[model samples]
Target: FNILLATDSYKVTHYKQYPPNTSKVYSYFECREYEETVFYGLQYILNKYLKGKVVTKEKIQEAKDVYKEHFQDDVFNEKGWNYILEKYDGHLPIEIKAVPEGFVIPRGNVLFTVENTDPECYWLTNWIETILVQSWYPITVATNSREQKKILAKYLLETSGNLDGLEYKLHDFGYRGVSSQETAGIGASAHLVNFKGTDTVAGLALIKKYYGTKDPVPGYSVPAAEHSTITAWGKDHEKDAFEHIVTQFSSVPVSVVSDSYDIYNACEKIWGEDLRHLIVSRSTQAPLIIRPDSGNPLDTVLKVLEILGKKFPVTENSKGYKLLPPYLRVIQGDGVDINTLQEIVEGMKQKMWSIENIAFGSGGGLLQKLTRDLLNCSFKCSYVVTNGLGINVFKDPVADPNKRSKKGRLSLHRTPAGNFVTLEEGKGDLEEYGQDLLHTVFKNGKVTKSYSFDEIRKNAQLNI
Candidate 1:
C-alpha cells in the first residue's frame, strides 16, 4: 500500500484525495504543512511584488514542491496505495464525496461536494475553484476527440472497404493546426491513443514517452517532394512556377504545383501526359503528390482528381483514379483537423475519389492552441478542514455552484453500469453510500506507488 500527501498547493487546492478508511484532523497549520510552502510563499511574494501582472510563481512552485516531497515514498514503495491519516486539524468532521479527475464526466453530473466542520473556513474553500476547473477540462476534450476518431475510422472502413491497408499516418495529421506548443503535444498523444497522429513534433515526443514509438520507422527511404502556393497563385505565377519546379527536379517524378494557376490547367497544361513517365522515373516514385494550399481544399481536390483521371490512365503508365500504377497523389493542406479531414475523406468516398488520391498536411486547427473551453472540460472541486465543532466548508462566492468547491471529506463513486456518479455532498457513511472515487495518488509524502508511463497511458485510455 502507498499514500500521497497534499503538499503541492494545487493538489490540495480544491479536493484532497485520501486513502480509503483514512481519518483527518482540521488544523490551519496542517493545511499548509506538508510541502506546498513553495507555492504559498511564491503566491504571497507575487501578490505583493508582481501585483498580478501575468506572474504566477505560486501555483507551479507549489506543484513542484508537492511532487518533490511525495515522489519518493508513495509512488516508489508499493504497487498500490498505502494508508495515511489525512488530518485537517482545525475544524469538525464532515465527510465528502465526488468524481475523480480524469473521468469522462458529462456536462450535468455532480462532479463533487464538500461540507466543512466550521462554516468560517468557507473562505479557504473558495481558493480551489480555479485550479480544479483548469485541471480537469483537458481530459474531457482529449477523451471526446479519441471517441471521435474511432467513429471516423468505422466510417472509413465502411465507405472505402480497404481499411487495414493504410499506414499509421492515416490518422495522425492533426498536430499542425492546434493552438499551442504544449497543447499540440498533449492533444496529439490523446488522439494517438486511438491511432490518430499529429504533425507537430512536440506531440510525437509525448507519444513516444508513453507509447514507446511514433511510427514503425519508414522501411525504404524516399525523398518525397512537397510544395506550397499551389492553388491560389496559379494564374499570376504560372510561368515562374513551372520553371522553378522543372529546373529543380528536372526528369524526376516531379509533382508540379498544379492548383496554382487553375487546378485544371496546372494538371492539363503544365503537367500533361508527356511528362508522366519522366515524373515516375525521375522522382523515383510512381506518382507525384500534388498539394493544394489555398482555396476550398475538398472541392478543389475533387476537381483536380476528376480531370487528371481522364488524362492519365494507369495503363498509359500515367496514374489516375482507379488506375493501377497510381502515378499521382493529390495532397491537401489548410486548416486540417479531425472534423474537416473526416469530411474530406467522406466526400471523396461519395464522389468515387481514390482512397490513395488524397493525403493531408495539417496545422494550427488541431494542435496546441486548444484551451479548456474549446475542449469542453474543466477541473473544479475543493478542500475543506473540519473538527468535531462543525465542518468548515470551502466555497468561492464568485464562482458558480457548477464550478464551486466540493464539500466534506470527498469520495468518488463509479457505478456498475459504467456511469460514474458522484455521491451527494453529505453522503459518505450511508449503507448505500456508493463506491468512493479518489484513490491515493501520492501518500506519506512520497510516491511509493509508481505507475509506469504505459500504465498511466492505459489508465488514461480507460478513464478518458
Candidate 2:
C-alpha cells in the first residue's frame, strides 16, 4: 500500500488550507474514555506502515493520480511532494513523541505528540492523522484485555489466592471475527500484550515480524476441534466423535465444541456415562476443554457446570468454592464482553463453583466490537508556528464542552504518587516534570527507537 494514499481524501488538498506562513503544526493524539488504559500499538504501527523511506516519486504520482480526478479539482499537493522528494529524498520530515508503548495510563492524556521537523512541511503534521489515529484500535484492544485481567485476577486471588493459570483464562478466538487481516493480526498482538492465550496465529506472526519475539513464543493455541469437525461425524454418531477426539489427543490439552447437537447431553451422556472411564483413565496430560458456543451465556454456563459436577468428581477450593476435576473444564465462547464475563463468574461464585472451573474466549467483543469513540480517540492540532510566531490552537464548543481540546504544546508526566498527568501548553518543560514520559520514537521517516514484545509486556504490567 502507498503511505501517501493512506489518508482521508480531502486531506490531499489540505496543504494550502493551512494558515498563511504556517511554519510548523503541532498535534496530539488522545483518548477520552479517561479511565486508565494500556498505551500500546503505536510501535507496531510505526514498524509496519510508517517506517523507513516510505515516500518515492512513484508513490507521489500514485497519490496524485487518484486525488486530481478524485476531487475534480487541481487540489493535489504536487509541489509539496516534489519538495519532499528532492530535499529529503522522500523521507517524511516529521517527529513523533509518545508515551512509551505499553505504559498503563488513563485516557484523555496526550498519548503522543506530532510536529513538523522541517518548517516547510507544516501541513504534514495533521495530514498524517489518518495513520496516527489508527492507533485507537490496538490501544483499545489492549485496554479491553487489561480490564479483564484485573477482574479475573480478583476472582482468582479470592478463590485460590494464587494466579497460576490466569494467563490462560481469557483466550483470543477473535481472528475470524474481525474485518481484515491487518485488524485481526494487530488486534491479536494488542490483546496478547496482556494475556497469552489465543487461537489466532496472525497475531503471533505480527509480533514476531514487527516486535521482537525471543524463545517461548508470544501467544499459543492448542489442538482443538471446531463444530464442523465434531458434527462431521454425524449427529447419531456424536458420542463416537467425542470418543475419538479425547482418545486421539491423549497427551495434550484439546478443546471440543460440545454444543453441536446437545451440550448438556454431550457433557452428561457422552463424556460422563458412556466414556467416563476412558476420560478418567487417560493420561492426566490430556485435559478436555468443553465449549458451549451458543444460547444465553450466563444461563448456559450455569446449566453445563451443574451437569458436569454430577458427572465428575468435584472438590472444594481453599475459599470453599467447588472445583471441577483439573482434567476437565468448560469454556464459554459466546457473548463474552467484560460485563458478561463478570456476570458468569459472579454467578459461578454464588453457586460455590471455583473460578478455575472455567475459562473464557471472546471473538467480536475482543477484536471487532469497538469504535474510535470508545475513548473518543482523536488527533487534533494544538500548536502552530505561523507567520513567524507560535499560536495556541484548540477547540471549545458551546454545545459540547467535552469536545474541547487542550491548548499549546503538551507533555505527559507521572506524579510522585505514581499517577499520570498530562501537562499542557509546554508546562512539561518545568521542574516538576521530572519524568517526561513521552519518548521520541520516530523522526524523519526512521524509527529512532524500537521496543521488543518482551519489553512492552513488562512495561504494561509495571503499575498494574
Candidate 3:
C-alpha cells in the first residue's frame, strides 16, 4: 500500500513542479481495436477510489516519505504533496463525467472525460492514470460476453424457436485460469452482464459486494466432477464414474467430463446405452450435462449429440433442426474460444442439430488472454485550459492518421436514431442534441450514482 501511494505521489509531484497554466484539462477514453463496443467498468473505478471519505494527514505524510525515499537523486517536491493535502482536504481534486456503466460506445467513440475541478490541481487526473487505463479488463470482458450472447441468441432463436435458458448457455470456466483472485472475480462479474452460469465462485461474491446483489446472486453453477474425481475411480471404472455422477446427484443437474480414457466409448456405451434409461427417465430430476473435454470440439460435440439423440427420443423444432430432450445435453469445454465456439455452433447448424443441445465453458481464452490493446483502448488529454484560455489539444502524428484524436471538452449524447455521438462543449448547441447520455457518476470524492446488477444486464441488451 505504501509503495502504491508513493508511486502516485511521484507522478503528482512531477506534474506539480512543471505545472501547466491550465485551470482545466479535458481528456477522453476510447477503443480503437474491435468493430463492436460495449462500455463498462467506470462504476468500478468510482467505487474503489472516489467513494471514500476525505484524504488524511497520515496519508500525505506517507506519500511524502515515498517521494523522498524513492527519488533520492532528484529533488523531492514537498510543495506538491502539501498543496493536495491542504487544498482538497484529502478529497481528489478532479471531476469526471462518464456514460452510465451499461452504455454502449462504438469503436472510436469517446467513453468519458476528466478535468481537475480545482484550478491549482493541474495534474491530478493524469496522476492516477494507471487505474483509469487498466479499467479495460472489465469493459473488454463485458463486451466479449455480450458478443457471445448475440451469437448464442441467433442460434437459440433458429434452433429452439425461442430464447429459453439463454443465460445459462455460456458458463464461466476461467477462474483457475486467471492471473489472480481479483482478476477472476472481476472477469466473472463482467461475464455475468450477459450470462448467468459460472464456475467462478469469486464472481458471485464480487457482484454482491460491488453491485449490492444478494444470494441467488447474478451467477450460478451446478455440481460437477473433474478429471481427478473421474480418473480416481481407475481407468476401467469410467462407467462407474458416469453412474455415480448421474445418479448420486439426481435431484439437480449434474455435469460430468466423460473423456477420461475413450471419449467415444464413454459417450456411446456408458452414457449413451448403459445409463440412457436412468438419465432419460429421471423425470423429477434435473438434466444430465455431458462434457467432452478433449479432441476436436466440433466433431466431438456433433458425435456426442448424435450418439445421445439416437439412444433417447429426439424431437424437431420449427426450424427443422433436431432437438435433444431437456434431460440430455452437451457442454463443449475443450478448446473453446470465440472462433471455435462459432465453428462448433455453425457445424451443428450445418448438421441440422439444435444449438440448445450444446453449451460452452471458456477458460484462459475468456479471462487470461486479453489486454487493453485487444480493443485498442487509450486515454489522452484533448483539452487544456492555460492562463485563463481554453485550448483544444490533440495529436495527429504524420506516421499514423488513425491515431488522430478529438478536441475540446466533450459530452456523449444519444441520437434519435439510437446511436451514440460525441458532443463538444462549445462546438454545437446542447439543446439540439436528442439526449445527453453521460451522467454524473462520480464527483468530489463521492459516488453520486449507483447501479444494480439487474439494471446493468438490462442495459447491455444489444441488437444482433
Candidate 4:
C-alpha cells in the first residue's frame, strides 16, 4: 500500500488534456462551507512532498510500476512521469500564492492558486490534487481548534477574571484514535494552534521537523495512567494505585484517570476524603488533575466539579463565577466533540463553575470525523494560458447551485470594510481599493515564506 497516497495511478488520468498551445493552467483552492473563512495548512503538504528535494527518479518509477500493474489495459502517462522526473530538480515548476497558514478566507474567496510556471507543465499543477485535499484535515482541525479556543476564551474571561490557563484548556488525545501516525501528527499540530497541551507525541515531532524548532516544542502533556495501569492494581486496591501515581510523579503535575471503577467514589471517597491533603497540601508542587473518562461529558464534569468543590476551597472571581483552587482540576476526556464541548462549557457556566475548573480531551472527533465536504473544500481549474491568451473557465451545474466554481485567475483581497473578497484577474473596477491577502508562499519548489509556530498561534489568536 502507498504510504502517502502519492502512488495512486488513477490521479494521472483524472483531468482533461491541456488544449494545443496551452502554455499554462491555473487552479484555485477554496473552502465553501462557512461564510467566515478557512484556516490554511499548505505547509504540511509541502514539507512532505517538496521538502529537501526528496522526490526522485526511484520514487517515480516505483509509483509507475504500481500504476502499470493496477491498470494493465489503460494507458499510463509514462512520458509525463519521465518529464517530471527529469525536470523536477527538487522544485515544482509552479507558482503558489496563498493566504498565510492561520488566516481565514471567506467562502468563495480563493485561498490559494496553482499556476503552471514552465509552459510545459499544465498537468503538473493539478497533479498535487491528492496532497492538496489531504490538507483539509489539518486546516479544518486548526480552524475548529481555534473556534474552541474562542469559546474557552470567552468563558475564561467571564469566569476566571482572565485567560490565565487558556493555553492548556483543550488537550489532544487523537493519536490512538486516528487512522495513522501521519493523521495523528497533522491533527495534533493543528490543535497546537490554540492550545499548548497534547498527548499525541507525534505532533511534537512534526512541529520540530516542519515548523523548524525543537528546544521549545509546540505542545506538552502530563504523565498519566490509562485504564490498564489502574485496573492492574485490582478493583479493591484502586486507592493504592492513585496513591502510587501521586507519589511517583509527585514533583511534576500528573493526571489520574478516576473512572476505572466508580468515578464518584474515586472523587468523593478516594481522592477527596483520603488523598485530599496529599493533593492540596503540596502548594509548592504541581497540580493533580482527575480524569473521568467515561460518562456523559456535561454531567460527569459538573458532578466531578461539585464533588471537588465541596472538598477543596472554592472562591469567586470578579464575574461571580466559582473557581477551582490551583491544586486541582478536572478533565473530561471521553465523548468530547465541538457540540459536546460547547454544551459542557455552557453547563459549567450555568452551574456557576469557572471555565478554568475543567479541561477537555478529544480523539477521533478531532482528527478523523471531519471530511472535505464538511467545508465544501475544492480545487478547480479557473484559468488557462493558451497561445498567449488568458481565458477564465467556470462551471455552473444547473442541478446544484452550490457546485458552481469561481472563474478566471483570482486573488483574495481585503476590502476597505475589513472583509475579504475575490478579485478576478484583469478586472478594472474594485482594483484600487483592494489589498491582496494572498502572498507568494511557494514558487519553483521552495517555500518562500516560512512561519514559526508562535507566529501562527499569535495570528490565529488575533484573527481566527
Candidate 5:
C-alpha cells in the first residue's frame, strides 16, 4: 500500500503541469518510492542511450531550484549517486509494481503493489507514471490492432476470394492521432510490436525526430515504401501527369493521386482503353497503383473500377484497354486509418467490392483518428521535495473507470497464448521476487546494453 515516487515524474508532471495552481510543496527526504520511479525512468533512458544519462549531474542540477524554486523555498540536495545508493543497498529486496504492457488487465484488478524491499529504493518506485504510460498506449492500440488485424485481414480475404494481399504491409498510421509527440513515438513502436507492418518506420522516424533516437523498439526508421503528394489546379496533374508517371515509373511500382481533379475524369482520361495498354506494356512486372485522396472512397473506387472495365478490355494486350496486370491495385489515402479502413472494409463485404484492387496510404486518418484524446499515454504520480530530504506521493484516479493507475513496479507478464493476460493465480507473489520491467538500465554514468537498430525493430514486433 506504500505509494511510489520518482524524480523524473516529479520533473515532467510536477513542474510542467503543476506548481502555478497548487500550494508551495516540500518534503523532508527523498521518499524511497520517488527514488525508484526515477530509477526506472532513468533505466529506460539509459537503455535507449537517450543522452539524458550522460548529463545526469546536469539534469539533477538543472532540476534544482532552477525552475522558479524561490516560490517554495526548496532545493535539490542529494547527488544522483545518493538516489542510486538508496535503490541498490542489497539488504532490502525491492518489491515492484506495474500495469505491464500486453496484458488485458481487468477493470477492477489491482495492477500494482510493492512490499519487502529497501524502503529507500522503494520510494523511487512510485513516480513512474508518465514514461510507463507513454510506453503502454501504442502497444495497447497495437494489441487492439493485432486482434483487429486477424479479423479484418481474414474478412478481406473472405470477401475478395483472394488471400494473397494481406501481410506485413499493415502499417500503424496513427502518429498524428496520438495524445502527444511522446505518445506518437511510442504508439508507433507498439503497432510494429504487434503486427508485421511497414508504416511503423514513419512512426520510428517521428520518435527519433522528436525524442532523439531511432530506437522505438529498433530499426523502425527503415521505411519500405515511398509516397508523394499531387496538389490541385495543376492541369493534367492526374490526366497527363498520371499516365506519364505510369509510363516512366512503371517499373518502380507507383501510386497516382487519382482524386487530384475530377478523379473520375482523371481515370477515364488517362487509364481509359487506349492508355492502359501503353502503361501495361511499360511495366508488366511491377504493379500500377492509383490513390483516391478525397470523396466517398467506397463509391468513388467502385466508379473508377467500373469505368476502367467498361472502357478497356478485361485482359492484357488487347487493342482496347483490357484487364490490368495482377500487379495493378488501387490505394486509398485521405481520411484513412484503422477506423475508416475498418469501416470501408466492412462496408465492402455488403456491396462486396474487390479489396484485392486496393491498398492504403493512410496518414492522418489512420494514425491520428485511432484513439480518443489519445487515451492513457501519460500520467504523473509523485515528486520528491524537502530538498531531496522530503517526499510526497501522487496517483491517478483517472475519472475513467478503466484508467485508474497502479502506483508501483510494473512487470509485463506474458500468457501462454502469446496474448496479453494476467499471470496465473497462486504464482509466487511478486512481492517475494525482485524482478521488474523497468530495472536499472543505466548505472554510475554508463549504459549496460548496446541495442542495434535492427534489434529495436525486431524487439518492437516481439514485445507485441
Candidate 6:
C-alpha cells in the first residue's frame, strides 16, 4: 500500500499550513463516547501497511500523477516524500506509543500517541491519521463482541451453571456480510479477541498471518451447511442433505441450517426420528449443531431447543435447566446482535432450557453493523512544538462541549485503584501519575513491540 495515498486529499496541503518553525506535532487517538473500549488492530495495520521502507521514488511519482488527475491543481507533497526517501530510505521517522493490543480501557483516554521523530517531518504525524484512525473498526468490533460474551457469560452461569467451552458460544458469520476483504480480515480477527469460533476464513487467516506463528491460532470454524447447501436440495430432499453433512463430517461439528421448509418438522421428524440414531449413537464422531436461518430468532431458537430436547435424551445440569443430549445443539445465525442475543438468552431462562444448548452466529451485525459513532471516535493534535517551545493545543468547539478535544501532551496512567486517566499539560514524565500505560510500540517504520494472538486473547479475558 502506498502510504502517501492512504490519507485524505486535504492532508497534502497541511505541510505548508503548520505554524512557522514548528518542530513537533503530537496527536492522540481515542473514542469520546464515554464508555469502555477495547484496543486492537493497530499492530495489524502497522505490519500490513505501514512497516518497512515504504517510501519509494516510484510510489511518490505514482501518487503525484494520481493527485494531478484528482485535484487538478498542484497540491502534492512530493518534495516531502523525497526528503523522507533520501533521509530515512523510505522508512518513516514516526514514533507511535499505545496500550498493548487486547487492552480494555475506558474511552477518552489516549489509546495511542503519534509524533514525528524528526522535527522537519512534523506534518507526518497527522497525515497518517486517515489510516491510523481506521483502527476504530477493529477496536469497536472487538468491544462489541466482548460485551456480548460478557452478557452470555452472565446468563450461561446463572442458568446452565457452567462456563466450559464458553468461547465457542458465538461464531463469526460475518465474512460475506462485510464491505471488503480488508475489513473482513481485520474485523474477523477482532472478534477472535473475545472468542475462538469464527466462520470468516479471511479473519482466521489474517490472525495467523499477523498475530501468531499460525500455531496457536485462535480463529477456528466448524463445517457449515448454509441455506445454499440445504435449499439446493429442493426442500423434499432436505433430510438427505443434512444426513450427508453429519455423516460426511462426523469427525468434526457439522452445523446444518434446518429452516429450509418447516423448521419444527425438520428438527423433530428428521433429526428427532430419522437422523436420531446417527447423532446420538456412539459411532457419530461430532455434535450436530442445527441452525435456524429465517423468521424471528427469538421465536425460532427457543422452539428448536425445545424440539431437540424432547427428541433427544435430555439431562439436567446443577442449575436445573433442561439440557439437550451432548450430540445436539442449536445455533441462531439470523437477527443476532447484543440486544437480540441477550433477549434470546432470557427466553431460555424462562423456558427452563440450558444456555449451553444454543450458540450464536453473527454476520453483518458483528462486523458491518456498527459505525464510528458507536464510540464517537476521534484523532487530533493535542500538542505542538513551535519555535523551540512546546505549546499545548486543542479545540473547544462552541457548538458542542462534548466534542471538545483534549489539550496538551497526553500521558496514559492507571491509578492505584485501577482506574485509567489521561494526564494532560506535559505531566507524563512525572512518577506521581503512576506508571504510564502508554508504551512505544512503533518507531521509524519498525514495530518496536508486538503481541501474539493468544496473549491478546488472554489479556481481554471475560472476567466473571
**The best candidate in terms of TM-score:** 2
Q: Give the Cα error of residue 367 in candidate 4, in Å.
A: 1.7
- Those runs of model 4 whose alpha carbons end farther than 4 Å from true positions after fitting are 1-8, 14-16, 33-38, 51-60, 87-90, 213-215, 428-430
Question: Model 2 TM-score?
Answer: 0.97
> Per-residue lDDT for 1-464 in model 5, tens only?
11112335344333334333332231111111100110112223323432222234344455453533633544333442245434443122323344332333322232333332233333333333333333433434554455445545666556544445454335455555556765555556445444445444455554344333443433322112222434433553445555556666656666566665577876776676546775555454466666666788767666777666665545532122223446565666666655667777666555445555566554454344444233333343332332234234444456754443333223434444633322223232454433333223223334433434334334333111
Q: Can you write out model 1's per-residue Cα lDDT over 73-177, one digit (the tens) per residue?
A: 222211111111113221112223233322344443444332333333332233323433433323433554555445455554554444442333233445445
Ranking by TM-score: 2, 6, 3, 4, 5, 1
lDDT of 6 by residue, 1-464 (tens): 78889999899899989988998999999998426888999999899888899999999999999999999987898888999999999998999999999989987888999999998899999999999999999999999999999888998899876787789898899988999999999999999899889888888778887898446666677888878888887768998898888888887878888888899999999999998888886333478888888998888887887788778889888899988777787889998989999899998899988888889999988899999889988999999999899988998889899888888988899787978899998797788977788888999989999999888887888668
Model 3 spans with C-alpha error above 4 angstroms: 1-13, 16-20, 75-77, 428-430
- Candidate 6 yields a Cα-based lDDT of 0.88
lDDT of 4 by residue, 1-464 (tens): 22223634566775355687888888888886444543646887776675445446676666667667777754556665556557886467778888887775566678888887788777777777767767778878887777777788887888777888788988888888898988888888898887889999998888887875535778878898899989999989999999998999877878899999899999999998998878986553478889999888888899999998898888887889897787787888998888898899999999999888788888877777887887778888888888999898988899998998888878776677977778876452455755667788788878888777766776777332
Worst 10 residues of 1 by lDDT: 32-41
How close to the true structure is residue 385 of candidate 3, measured as C-alpha lDDT? 80
Runs of candidate 2 exceeding 4 Å displacement? 462-464
Error of 4 at 204 (Å): 1.2
Candidate 3, after superposition: displacement of residue 198 in Å? 0.8
**Candidate 3 per-residue C-alpha lDDT over 1-464 given as tens digits, one digit per residue, 9 for 90 to 100:** 32136234456555645436767766778885357676777777677655555456676666566657777744454465467667766667677777777776788877877778887767666766667877789989998888788888998898778888888998999998999998898898899888889999898877887786544678788988899999999988888888887788988988899888878888788877888878887643488888899988899888888887777789988889998888887899877878888898889999999888888999987778888888888888888888888877888999998788888877777777977678764554557876566667677777777788777777888664
RMSD of each candidate relative to the true structure: 12.2, 1.3, 2.3, 2.5, 9.4, 1.7
lDDT of 2 by residue, 360-421 (tens): 99999889999888878888999998889988899999999889999999988878887888
Clashing pairs in 6: none
> Rank order by lDDT, top first?
6, 2, 4, 3, 5, 1
By how many angstroms RMSD does model 1 differ from the true structure?
12.2
- TM-scores of the candidates are 0.56, 0.97, 0.93, 0.92, 0.62, 0.96
- Screening candidate 4 with a backbone cut-off below 3 angstroms (N, C-alpha, C), the clashing residue pairs are none
